Design a protein around this ligand. Structure first.
Ligand SMILES: B=[P@@](O)(OC[C@H]1O[C@@H](n2cc(C)c(=O)[nH]c2=O)C[C@@H]1N=[N+]=[N-])OP(=O)(O)OP(=O)(O)O
Ligand SMILES: B=[P@@](O)(OC[C@H]1O[C@@H](n2cc(C)c(=O)[nH]c2=O)C[C@@H]1N=[N+]=[N-])OP(=O)(O)OP(=O)(O)O
Ligand SMILES: B=[P@@](O)(OC[C@H]1O[C@@H](n2cc(C)c(=O)[nH]c2=O)C[C@@H]1N=[N+]=[N-])OP(=O)(O)OP(=O)(O)O
Ligand SMILES: B=[P@@](O)(OC[C@H]1O[C@@H](n2cc(C)c(=O)[nH]c2=O)C[C@@H]1N=[N+]=[N-])OP(=O)(O)OP(=O)(O)O
Ligand SMILES: B=[P@@](O)(OC[C@H]1O[C@@H](n2cc(C)c(=O)[nH]c2=O)C[C@@H]1N=[N+]=[N-])OP(=O)(O)OP(=O)(O)O
Ligand SMILES: B=[P@@](O)(OC[C@H]1O[C@@H](n2cc(C)c(=O)[nH]c2=O)C[C@@H]1N=[N+]=[N-])OP(=O)(O)OP(=O)(O)O
Ligand SMILES: [Mg+2]
Ligand SMILES: [Mg+2]
Ligand SMILES: [Mg+2]
Ligand SMILES: [Mg+2]
Ligand SMILES: [Mg+2]
Ligand SMILES: [Mg+2]
Lengths: 150, 150, 150, 150, 150, 150
């Protein structure tokens, strides 16, 4: 319940613009615990696996090349309904459609430069996390903060 | 009209997390005047009166004990439609449902740790203010800021 | 497409409250390029032209006098769908109705002290820009930021 | 002893400029705990007693009249060496001389509009606190934070 | 005299890094009043006249070429001792030597990318302002703020 | 050489207080580039090797036990004189002595809860980086930013 985890990723455009700390802080303020964190250069295979559900899309190729174009900071956050909440905090697909207050809403304008990526469902999160992180890279005994959880 | 007042309260979880100034500033930026302010430890009777409309609810008891568990900063803000506006700035009951930009939206995740409480109607506000503050604790001749009011 | 431009104006109430930099920064963070900028005291004629579509309204007169009451910082931003996006970032007509995260939502309370004004359509933007800025006051060869545009 | 205390007061200007929350949050970030808070309109006897040290100043009557001109938010913070630290966070007597990062450094320009006042010694703090606050308005249970204190 | 003025300019890098609003707001918070603003692409005659003091520098031609390489936002701020204060808020010549809290301290690392430029004396300010701004672009009515000035 | 590097680590307290993003963003604003990042729970061999310099300290065993008490986010930043600059941005050993604007100055109060640790020399940085990070976790392509470097 409270141990639900979602996978986030500061895209290459997000890293190049120096938005890593801003994004992280927003999740920390919200009360979600960071249980996995690292910066790396996505490999083509990682890019296509993460977005495999889009393989047949015409822009899939452009996406893969972009994701693997520069460093990316991968994160895993745990907390009550973190998956859908993280999505709300991100915005929607189109940055211009994303509301002020949301990451893409405040920083993005192009769907191709969406700043941050994140799991859209618990099912997808468990798959993405297992894809990007090895078991020994994630915290284990995470104790609920009495100020955040009842 | 412009002298409408609402009662806000930084819950114990909000005080313990050091969010007092953040919340206050947000109301100050909005243009609402702070006419009453103090920090105290709610007494059981104050807790049950404030939330009397919930007395029969199964979680009422847990709420009272929490509200009286630690210090709380009580505030009174005045301004055009401050009651409903203050609510919008807070979010909705469920922190996870609260939109980014809103207090609970940016800081909360659990209904039991909602960070801040506030009047839901002018009727409730007049009752809550009179409950938490004595007449001599509130400013009187508040002059409208020409930059904020037409 | 990506060269679309909108006209913004920090109203006199916005300038007097020291919100110029806050507003500008929000547009800069969003990724919109500032192609025209200056502070001036609107002339009655400029005020009535900008808001000519409201000439017959009962509050038109009050508006003109206010707009020309003090300095105003006029801005022109360019970017994908900047017109409608800029509006979203501003909020709606009524500041109290404007959502948190939006300029009026976070700073305003009175329709007469709306902090910032902005074009509601490409048609209106092209007219407002040409009204407030001379051609040699606007940048020309603006190169798309590879971090912002695909 | 992490139980040291000091008296901080954001002068009438501080409040008028809506800097209360900004101030309070700075001390919260530091890890200092608010043990007393309230808004009030200083009395002559109070202000004359607060600054009695400068009874022999050509600007004494001026200061008193200002301090009692509008509402003031009085605060008491507790923590390791909070007295001298609070002073450092405030700046120096002259706002223009105060360094960026410090309250007066970032917000003030006139010695008469110094934004915030604060005890200059434990001796002065114990006197100022006892002057502005009744024992019953002060937090009794002084709890230490493990993340802040070893 | 709270009517002192100084010339501030955020160099081409400052603008490219989208730091204009961040800068302007810092000076606004201080209580300094913007009496002149505009964006432009410096001319050789302008930049050579601005930094004529260093005509005898092996890096003079380099500085000129940079200053005229992209848009620049020129500003004029008025207030008590704004000249030296603005300097303090900027930092020192070397960004790495500039202290945290100061503009170059928080944003710069290279002397060639110093983010912002500013008059070093009232004499230099009066010359720089008259160089960059026409009398008609400067705010005439110099109004003092009671919360800022006694 | 703008290729200098230093090792920064936000201690267990830093993470518990959710200051990771706040920290990372400060260095990002400066223009320093993250070339390595990850979260982990330090080992005794690691912490004893990190602070081996103070093996002869009555508080050595205490520090080690703390450093290995909870997760830590290890970072590597590259840039002109990043080592000494990072130190300046951190503050001094004593948080209460650290100036406002600096990390410990704004967030710390106890030497034992210093929030963040950082190399004190290029020699120490090269050793600390090689200690905490494997060559494969470090960004190879070191690209300079024109707005930051001339
Ligand atoms: B549909 P999807 O998953 O988009 C993934 C990436 O596909 C690229 N893309 C998408 C669409 C729909 C398009 O028209 N053009 C395009 O280039 C960029 C995406 N990043 N996003 N967002 O949206 P989101 O779930 O919001 O984004 P992710 O969290 O990155 O999955
Ligand atoms: B329904 P109500 O008044 O909730 C009051 C408190 O009741 C507790 N509570 C509530 C509900 C509905 C529940 O399922 N469980 C629970 O513990 C916590 C509340 N704080 N809030 N919000 O919502 P709000 O009006 O948003 O909150 P307040 O402004 O504190 O009244
Ligand atoms: B309707 P319109 O253009 O309002 C323009 C100004 O008219 C004034 N006004 C408006 C209305 C509808 C009213 O009831 N009373 C009143 O004084 C103030 C406006 N500023 N705004 N917003 O709304 P917006 O498009 O949100 O505002 P602008 O971008 O300034 O045009
Ligand atoms: B010397 P002192 O105590 O001044 C108190 C206030 O008196 C006013 N004042 C002071 C002096 C010395 C003067 O020449 N003119 C003047 O108007 C404003 C002060 N606040 N400040 N700063 O400065 P500080 O101790 O830094 O500030 P406080 O905490 O307000 O006491
Ligand atoms: B000495 P000066 O005026 O330098 C002006 C700019 O010249 C460039 N420069 C300077 C020197 C001395 C050098 O060795 N190399 C170099 O490229 C960059 C400057 N901006 N700065 N800082 O520094 P400041 O007065 O602090 O800054 P400005 O307000 O830009 O004049
Ligand atoms: B002297 P040093 O290296 O101290 C390292 C940590 O050791 C702990 N400590 C230190 C000293 C000297 C002491 O008396 N008591 C104590 O608990 C906490 C330290 N972090 N700090 N600051 O301080 P710094 O170099 O400023 O900080 P680090 O980057 O953590 O090394
Ligand atoms: Mg997706
Ligand atoms: Mg309720
Ligand atoms: Mg309109
Ligand atoms: Mg004093
Ligand atoms: Mg110079
Ligand atoms: Mg050390």
């Amino acid at each position: 319940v409270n141990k639900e985890r979602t996978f986030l990723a500061v895209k290459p455009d997000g890293v190049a613009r120096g938005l890593v700390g801003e994004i992280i802080a927003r999740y920390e303020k919200k009360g979600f615990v960071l249980v996995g964190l690292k910066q790396l250069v996505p490999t083509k295979d990682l890019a296509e696996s993460h977005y495999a559900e889009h393989k047949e899309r015409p822009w899939f190729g452009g996406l893969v090349s972009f994701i693997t174009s520069g460093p990316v900071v991968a994160m895993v956050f745990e907390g009550k309904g973190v998956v859908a909440s993280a999505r709300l905090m991100i915005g929607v697909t189109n940055p211009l459609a994303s509301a002020p207050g949301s990451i893409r809403g405040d920083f993005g304008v192009d769907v191709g430069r969406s700043i941050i990526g994140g799991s859209d469902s618990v099912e997808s999160a468990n798959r993405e996390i297992a894809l990007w992180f090895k078991p020994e890279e994630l915290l284990t005994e995470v104790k609920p903060n009495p100020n955040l959880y009842e």
